[PDB]
């Protein structure tokens, strides 16, 4: 095939998703007049800071979803289970794409730039390695707002999260994003062989992260109290 580009209706969908994304980006991308770095084998420092931005960070993934018509058109019950399943996957994506090879740091909530270790011992553990790997891995991809946005959309519209009722519709919306995405990619023409396949594999990585983080939080879910974690963090990442 000549690799088709967006259709009239897809272009409309792409504009809609990009806007949802751009609007709920932390700053959107000018961690240049914003970010600033952090001066043990636990990091009460890094951790304390994390507890401070983790909330607005989760809040903007919710606000991204509230901005997708298809998503608003879902029963709040599925809307909840859907958000909880892709929350970490979207946050990590958003952080991964802000990896600065120079400073070898990611940028969280578009304000705090952290190192691998800082994030590793600030509460994420090996996940930090995973998101950092993904970050470096993505430089080569060169993704714009739309691609990242579509990616978040695809992650959001996962019909495999247990408890969903409107599974078929969620699958319909997803395939719909996937296609628009695939065509947007046809238009972009990245100088990367097998770019589309290579990309979808990153989604599997973001999913893995999601699962590892879930496993992670539950293992400590109750070795630690809740006096430590922001209420919103708890509403999301505990069963
Ligand atoms: C990867 C990331 C992205 C992020 O927002 C990025 C963005 O969307 O701009 C914010 C944070 C704190 C992080 C790191 C993080 C994510 C989940 C998580 O459970 C932890 C450990 C933690 C858990 C509760 C309180 C503080 C720290 C850190
Ligand atoms: C430097 C950069 C990096 C970037 O990272 C993603 C990528 O480059 O693929 C994205 C953008 C849009 C930019 C630059 C930019 C320049 C002018 C401009 O009007 C825009 C879009 C925009 C304009 C005003 C406010 C927010 C966003 C981006």
Labels describing this entry:
monomer, 239 residues, mainly alpha, Retinoid X Receptor, two-stranded antiparallel sheet, 2 strands, 65% helix, globular, binds ligand G24, Thyroid hormone receptor beta, transcription, sequence-specific double-stranded DNA binding
In short:
The PDB classes it as transcription. With 239 residues, the protein is mainly alpha-helical.
What is the topology?
Elements: H1 8-24, H2 44-66, H3 69-72, H4 76-96, E1 106-108, E2 112-114, H5 116-124, H6 127-139, H7 145-156, H8 167-188, H9 195-221, H10 231-237
Antiparallel strand pairs: 1-2
Bound molecules: the ligand Cc1cc(OCC(=O)O)cc(C)c1Cc1ccc(O)c(Cc2ccccc2)c1 (2 copies).
Helicity range of the residues?
55-70%
Number of E-type strands: 2
How many helices? The count is: 10
Radius of gyration: 18 Å
Q: List all distinct small molecules, including ions and cofactors, that are bound in this structure.
A: the ligand Cc1cc(OCC(=O)O)cc(C)c1Cc1ccc(O)c(Cc2ccccc2)c1
> Which architecture name does CATH use?
Orthogonal Bundle
Largest sheet: 2 strands, antiparallel
- Distance linking N and C termini: 45 Å
Can you tell me the CATH topology?
Answer: Retinoid X Receptor
Number of domains: 1
Sheet with the most strands: spatial strand order: 1-2
**CATH classification, class level:** Mainly Alpha
In what range is the share of β-strand residues?
under 5%
Function: Nuclear hormone receptor that can act as a repressor or activator of transcription. High affinity receptor for thyroid hormones, including triiodothyronine and thyroxine.
Family: Belongs to the nuclear hormone receptor family. NR1 subfamily.
Subcellular location: Nucleus
Binding site for 3,3',5-triiodo-L-thyronine 1: 213
């Amino acid at each position: 095939g000549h690799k088709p580009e967006p259709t009239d209706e897809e272009w409309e969908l792409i504009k809609t998703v990009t806007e949802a994304h751009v609007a709920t980006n932390a700053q959107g991308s000018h961690w240049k007049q914003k970010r600033k770095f952090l001066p043990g084998k636990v990091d009460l420092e890094a951790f304390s800071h994390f507890t401070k931005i983790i909330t607005p960070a989760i809040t903007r993934v919710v606000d991204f979803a509230k901005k997708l018509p298809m998503f608003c058109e879902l029963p709040c019950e599925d809307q909840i289970i859907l958000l909880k399943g892709c929350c970490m996957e979207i946050m990590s994506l958003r952080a991964a794409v802000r990896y600065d090879p120079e400073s070898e740091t990611l940028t969280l909530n578009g304000e705090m730039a952290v190192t691998r270790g800082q994030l590793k011992n600030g509460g994420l553990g090996v996940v930090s390695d995973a998101i950092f790997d993904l970050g470096m891995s993505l430089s080569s991809f060169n993704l714009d707002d739309t691609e990242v946005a579509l990616l978040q959309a695809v992650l959001l519209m996962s019909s495999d999260r247990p408890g969903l009722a409107c599974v078929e519709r969620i699958e319909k919306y997803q395939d719909s994003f996937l296609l628009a995405f695939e065509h947007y990619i046809n238009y972009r023409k990245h100088h990367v062989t097998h770019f589309w396949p290579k990309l979808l594999m990153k989604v599997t990585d973001l999913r893995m992260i999601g699962a590892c983080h879930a496993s992670r939080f539950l293992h400590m879910k109750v070795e630690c109290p809740t006096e430590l974690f922001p209420p919103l963090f708890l509403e999301v990442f505990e069963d």
